[PDB]
Amino acid sequence: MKLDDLNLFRLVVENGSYTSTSKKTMIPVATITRRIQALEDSLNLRLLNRHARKLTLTEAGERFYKDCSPLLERLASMTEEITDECRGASGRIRISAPSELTKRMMMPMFNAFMEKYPDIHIELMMSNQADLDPTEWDVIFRVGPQRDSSLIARKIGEVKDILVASPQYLSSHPQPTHAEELHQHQLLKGYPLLKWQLTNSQGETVVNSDRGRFQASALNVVRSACSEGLGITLMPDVMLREFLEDGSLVQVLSDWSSNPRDIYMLYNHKDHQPEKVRLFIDFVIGYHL
Amino acid sequence: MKLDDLNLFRLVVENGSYTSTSKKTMIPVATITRRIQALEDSLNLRLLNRHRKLTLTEAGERFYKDCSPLLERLASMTEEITDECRGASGRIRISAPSELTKRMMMPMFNAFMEKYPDIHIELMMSNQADDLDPTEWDVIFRVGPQRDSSLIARKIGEVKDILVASPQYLSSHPQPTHAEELHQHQLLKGYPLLKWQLTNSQGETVVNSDRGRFQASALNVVRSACSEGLGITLMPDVMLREFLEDGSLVQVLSDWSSNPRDIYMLYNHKDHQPEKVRLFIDFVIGYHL
Amino acid sequence: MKLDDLNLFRLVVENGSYTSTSKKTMIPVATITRRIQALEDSLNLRLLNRHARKLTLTEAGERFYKDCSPLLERLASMTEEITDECRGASGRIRISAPSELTKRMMMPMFNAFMEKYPDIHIELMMSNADDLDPTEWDVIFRVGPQRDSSLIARKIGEVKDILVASPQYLSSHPQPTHAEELHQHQLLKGYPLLKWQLTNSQGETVVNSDRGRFQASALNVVRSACSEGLGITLMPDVMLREFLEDGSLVQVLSDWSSNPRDIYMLYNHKDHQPEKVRLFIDFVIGYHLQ
Amino acid sequence: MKLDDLNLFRLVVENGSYTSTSKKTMIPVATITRRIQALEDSLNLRLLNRHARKLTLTEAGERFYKDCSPLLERLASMTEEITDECRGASGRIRISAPSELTKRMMMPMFNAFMEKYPDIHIELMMSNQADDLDPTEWDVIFRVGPQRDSSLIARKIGEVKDILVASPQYLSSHPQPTHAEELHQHQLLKGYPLLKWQLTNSQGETVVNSDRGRFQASALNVVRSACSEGLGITLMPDVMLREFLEDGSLVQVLSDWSSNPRDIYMLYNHKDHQPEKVRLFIDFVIGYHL
């Protein structure tokens, strides 16, 4: 009344806010705003209290969400169950990937898939660590060690993290020969490489947990700070090729190795996988890197 | 999905055809066509043959088998909730100032409840909010503004704080002429009236900050102490009506006034307000004092 | 600095709100805002984050509280136990009491005390559960058990709760002849008497947890509603006495009885204890009430 | 309280007289006399014989000084110690900035700041939803669009124009759109927050595109790469595009159709009530402007 406005209302409640819902459903905030307002205007009832930060349900809001959500869910669930069996070389694949590395590793592959399959659309959702329920997703990309899960997992690669510094910084601060000396250096750390675990040739492991001169939630900005000679950082070698090439960044502590992090493609057990998802999985497999 | 289109597909299967369904729903046949077509588009699946007796495809039979029952419960369920939620009967949550309510609000509340025996009231009282979160209340009564929300604010009354004492106290204690002489008297003070800021006829403003012989977190007990001739207090005019009229308490320093305090009513626009709350709001508005 | 401003800052933090601190310190929210602002202006540092109704502590705030709080506490405790021994029998007694029954029951006694001991002043706070720092109070009155704590406890009375309604109401609603029939009546309930537990002489107990036609956080406004013939309520007999007297309210199901609620006086053990506090305790123990 | 009068009392004892205390603290002799008496009146006790003409403490006086003065002393040393650390030009600061724009628009500045101040460390967090964050967790907040109002001081540091781009290769097989309305016939690549496209021409006509793109992402970056791969048209900040137009990997289309420009704000509490640590950052940004 309308059912889809009511179902959009359900989504808003589960994601906590309009912006959060927009990011997860890929629906513009302006459209969510409008449809929720239309619903309230049809009911003559305010379902949500909007004053930030927290969105809260009115008495009517609680009543609708409590009673109607279960059925709405079973409906969306039952529909998917049918569309998953039917067809087809068309549709939209919903993908979750780690915020970092997707740009330089995944996108080339994703772009290639959309070229081979112009009728298959992609909704890419990137969240760092993501911690998220697998069932709201067609395919999941994770980095590093995992645990059941029990989803179908396949190693599609691995990333090697190395320590680097600009020559400008190194001329000022003589480079360390032991990982323990890092405490005497300006360190630059970006998520999720905040806790450095390094092992050398003698089987000696040192763990650096310093907060660093510069700590960021993403690695690109840290990489930048490093180029400007603000200290030493730990970064995926794949992000360093260009700078190692031109020598603006140089590797340090080469005897000290950080354990390579495996790249995984995860997906749900179905026995009935939609053609769109089957096509995607097999494409990623045959793809290199 | 849309769900409303899936629901339309249901009514169509029930009624027997577009025209049949168009007559019962007043939905233009061409509309039903467009919307059923957009549904088959989203699914990339043909649900029924639009070519003359309408027949459901294997996918059509599937969708109607599983979804129709849920669509139906949901349809009646949403009907029931709205009927109750915007109905006149039901419980109402109200916040009012403690200590001033019994004398001012209760007659208004009692009258309301008598007029509307099916509307029930839950009344929380506080001297401290102000602070409390509005999303938990249908209507809020407070002293002074605001501060500051989207809540519609209506000034429905005012209180005038006056100084009183018993004939007995004034027998052994010479009545004060100037408010500065309050320093030589036994003062009875109660929250929220602790800092006495008194202005007289000539514009002279004196402030009494003395802790006072007796201090309570509520005025009503400070009132009894005053009747026992224990000293002078500052209290709302309405709480003193009878005692002033029976002689128990006599007013002093009548020319020394504090700033009047307005009583406001707070609520969200009646537009999207349940009939329960609308009736209470209007009743209060149509009420004297 | 001022040091009193700092101490107030501490008091605010420990309560975790401006409003809360206002009713607890007998200082208006406005004066509190003024002084906290003064403190931050003299420091040129922001201690609290206010705009957010949560009221958080900033880096500087966290630091000032952590390091100065212990000294402030010891200081306030020290100047207390110095003016305790050197002074007397004058001074102020901080008293905690229930909002429910104080006015009707304690005030006559409290008034009599202040009349007998003019130089002894009283700071009285009615409790909603603080809950509940004993060392902040000179004397504490509560209703019911137990708690129990390390406090010294004297039972000084009790209250019996009865069911009443106006003749007007009973005229159109014949009084109930069994506790169970309350489910069929308009009920008016006030804190802390929302859950009615009634017992007859035959051992039978019935519990009424109905939300009620009218539910309030205090009993006085409920009494008012009951007088307008709005229904049946459960209330301390001491608050109903003169209304039973004039027949404006009438008891029903005296057949059934609610558990009497004990009234206690609680105080921290100390020797020799401040003279002002001995006088009060002694006065109460020998005082005639219900 | 008043702790400050008690503290003044302490000073007097240590100085030996009102006048030597006035000379020390610059507080007028009449003021000292008035505040000491005011203290004595709140205690109803005498601490001093000011007429003695030679410092003489009462029994209460000796008691208060001996037990309290040491506490006051540590309190003064401590508040001075703490305000000294908050006025230090070092320490860590928490900064929040926009997901996509920080790298392009603000990192050069942050880098420059850290070079200038090696003892000030930066904790940087990027997010898409500037309204969903708690301002009390951050020293400085950079965000797109005006602040969901708070007590923060706001400062516009820049802005971004969102333009439409495609790769030359995409245009090889897809003739360029000459009207924003023709976008429905093209492949669109969209990324939050730019999902609903609202475009206005030089005549004030506004067209809105809410189509679901063949590719949609939670961030604009990966959208750019898809555009470079020739997968369609996208709407993106010019600051994220300029260098790709310049290297020839992208071209602008429908340039006469402008999108509502978005301002970059810098939010902070109050430069005065801020620890030197954070004030140096705010002033650095303000004058930078290089």
Coordinates of N, CA, C and O in Angstrom, one line a residue, chain B residues 128 191, chain C residues 5 8-9 11-12 15 17-39 50 55:
Chain B
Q128 N 13.5 17.6 35.1 CA 14.9 17.6 34.5 C 14.9 17.6 33.0 O 15.9 17.7 32.4
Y191 N 13.8 23.3 44.3 CA 14.1 23.1 42.9 C 12.8 23.2 42.2 O 11.8 22.7 42.6
Chain C
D5 N 35.1 25.5 40.4 CA 34.7 25.2 39.0 C 35.2 23.8 38.6 O 34.4 23.0 38.1
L8 N 33.2 21.2 40.4 CA 31.9 21.1 39.8 C 32.0 20.2 38.5 O 31.2 19.3 38.3
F9 N 33.1 20.5 37.7 CA 33.4 19.7 36.5 C 33.4 18.2 36.9 O 32.8 17.4 36.2
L11 N 32.0 16.8 39.5 CA 30.7 16.4 39.9 C 29.8 16.2 38.7 O 29.0 15.2 38.7
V12 N 30.0 16.9 37.6 CA 29.2 16.7 36.4 C 29.6 15.4 35.7 O 28.7 14.6 35.4
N15 N 28.2 12.3 37.5 CA 26.8 12.2 37.3 C 26.5 11.9 35.8 O 25.6 11.2 35.5
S17 N 25.8 14.2 33.3 CA 24.8 15.1 32.7 C 24.6 16.4 33.5 O 24.8 16.5 34.7
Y18 N 24.4 17.5 32.7 CA 24.1 18.8 33.3 C 22.8 18.8 34.2 O 22.9 19.1 35.4
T19 N 21.8 18.3 33.6 CA 20.5 18.2 34.2 C 20.6 17.4 35.5 O 20.1 17.9 36.6
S20 N 21.1 16.2 35.4 CA 21.3 15.3 36.5 C 22.0 16.0 37.7 O 21.6 15.9 38.8
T21 N 23.1 16.7 37.4 CA 23.9 17.3 38.4 C 23.2 18.5 39.0 O 23.4 18.8 40.2
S22 N 22.3 19.1 38.3 CA 21.5 20.2 38.8 C 20.6 19.9 40.0 O 20.7 20.5 41.0
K23 N 19.9 18.8 39.8 CA 19.0 18.4 40.9 C 19.7 17.7 42.0 O 19.1 17.5 43.1
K24 N 20.9 17.3 41.8 CA 21.7 16.6 42.8 C 22.6 17.6 43.6 O 22.9 17.3 44.8
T25 N 22.9 18.7 43.0 CA 23.8 19.7 43.7 C 23.1 20.9 44.1 O 23.7 21.8 44.7
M26 N 21.8 21.0 43.9 CA 21.0 22.2 44.2 C 21.6 23.4 43.5 O 21.6 24.5 44.1
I27 N 22.1 23.2 42.3 CA 22.7 24.3 41.5 C 22.0 24.3 40.1 O 21.9 23.2 39.5
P28 N 21.4 25.4 39.7 CA 20.7 25.5 38.5 C 21.5 25.2 37.2 O 22.7 25.6 37.2
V29 N 20.9 24.5 36.3 CA 21.6 24.1 35.1 C 22.3 25.3 34.4 O 23.4 25.1 33.8
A30 N 21.7 26.5 34.5 CA 22.2 27.7 33.9 C 23.5 28.1 34.6 O 24.5 28.4 33.9
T31 N 23.5 28.1 35.9 CA 24.7 28.5 36.7 C 25.8 27.5 36.4 O 27.0 27.8 36.4
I32 N 25.4 26.2 36.2 CA 26.4 25.1 35.9 C 27.0 25.4 34.5 O 28.3 25.3 34.4
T33 N 26.2 25.7 33.5 CA 26.8 26.0 32.2 C 27.7 27.2 32.3 O 28.8 27.2 31.7
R34 N 27.3 28.2 33.1 CA 28.1 29.4 33.2 C 29.5 29.1 33.7 O 30.5 29.6 33.2
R35 N 29.6 28.3 34.8 CA 30.8 28.0 35.5 C 31.7 27.0 34.7 O 32.9 27.2 34.7
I36 N 31.1 26.0 34.1 CA 31.9 25.1 33.3 C 32.5 25.9 32.1 O 33.6 25.6 31.7
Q37 N 31.8 26.9 31.6 CA 32.3 27.7 30.5 C 33.4 28.6 31.1 O 34.5 28.7 30.4
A38 N 33.2 29.1 32.3 CA 34.3 29.9 32.9 C 35.6 29.1 33.1 O 36.6 29.6 32.8
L39 N 35.4 27.9 33.5 CA 36.5 27.0 33.7 C 37.3 26.8 32.4 O 38.5 26.9 32.4
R50 N 29.5 19.0 24.6 CA 28.2 19.3 25.0 C 27.1 19.0 24.0 O 26.2 18.2 24.2
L55 N 27.0 14.0 26.1 CA 28.0 14.7 26.9 C 29.2 13.9 27.2 O 29.3 13.2 28.2

